[PDB]
Write a protein that binds this ligand. Structure first.
Ligand SMILES: *[C@@H]1O[C@H](CO)[C@@H](O[C@@H]2O[C@H](CO)[C@@H](O)[C@H](O)[C@H]2NC(C)=O)[C@H](O)[C@H]1NC(C)=O
Ligand code: CA
Ligand code: CL
Ligand code: CL
Ligand code: ZN
Length: 206
């Protein structure tokens, strides 16, 4: 056999003010939640041969630094414009906002398609919708997938996980049991993405 070259996603994760309020204004426990969610994101992405490197953690304890509203899309781009300033001081590949608020329209997470590594769109927003950390992580990993140009899984894609096991990450539907692996279809799409020049910033080992 042969060894595949690993990829690394330098991740910066942010907890908005509402999530902080939800965690009873406990800074330590809010940070712990972000770390646990990142941990599950790492587990999921590893099935794509991508390892997570947590660049930074940030909790908006007194005020949101970017406007977070019921509008997932508005919230996303407001966060992405804020991410630019942050990137200059603390470089990272992708910034992810975890919010305690719910979005209008049944939306649970959102990110720009194929924006991985781009200064203007390499990030995403996810709601911490489940008591379980893996819930938000699955949502965040799904959006990172979209960021990497991955589409939702077609008809018979995802054989490496059944219903009770949570299925695959790029499934069109979300809910418990949550997914822990990306389908083979997703893995092929990712290798094509890299080969074609996408996600150039995931090459350096932190
Ligand atoms: C999500 O929100 C952004 C920002 O409001 C939308 O982007 C704007 O799109 C319009 C029309 O395409 C342009 O005139 C603006 O210049 C864009 N603003 C930018 C680039 O920041 C985007 O279309 C929205 N996505 C939706 C609702 O699907
Ligand atoms: Ca990098
Ligand atoms: Cl290839
Ligand atoms: Cl080629
Ligand atoms: Zn999707």
């Amino acid at each position: 056999e042969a060894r595949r070259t690993r990829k690394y996603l330098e991740l910066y994760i942010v907890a908005d003010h509402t999530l902080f309020l939800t965690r009873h204004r406990n800074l330590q426990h809010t940070k712990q939640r972000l770390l646990e969610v990142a941990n599950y994101v790492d587990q999921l992405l590893r099935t794509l041969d991508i390892q997570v490197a947590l660049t930074g953690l940030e909790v908006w304890t007194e005020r949101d630094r970017s406007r977070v509203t019921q509008d997932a899309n508005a919230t996303l781009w407001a966060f992405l414009q804020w991410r630019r300033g942050l990137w200059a001081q603390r470089p990272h590949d992708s910034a992810q906002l975890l919010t305690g608020r719910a979005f209008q329209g049944a939306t649970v997470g959102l990110a720009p398609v194929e924006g991985m590594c781009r200064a203007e769109s390499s990030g995403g927003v996810s709601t911490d919708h489940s008591e379980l950390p893996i819930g938000a992580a699955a949502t965040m990993a799904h959006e990172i997938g979209h960021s990497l140009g991955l589409s939702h899984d077609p008809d018979g894609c995802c054989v490496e996980a059944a219903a009770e096991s949570g299925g695959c990450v790029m499934a069109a539907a979300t809910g418990h049991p949550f997914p822990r692996v990306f389908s083979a279809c997703s893995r092929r799409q990712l290798r094509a993405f890299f080969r074609k020049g996408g996600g150039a910033c995931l090459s350096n080992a932190p």
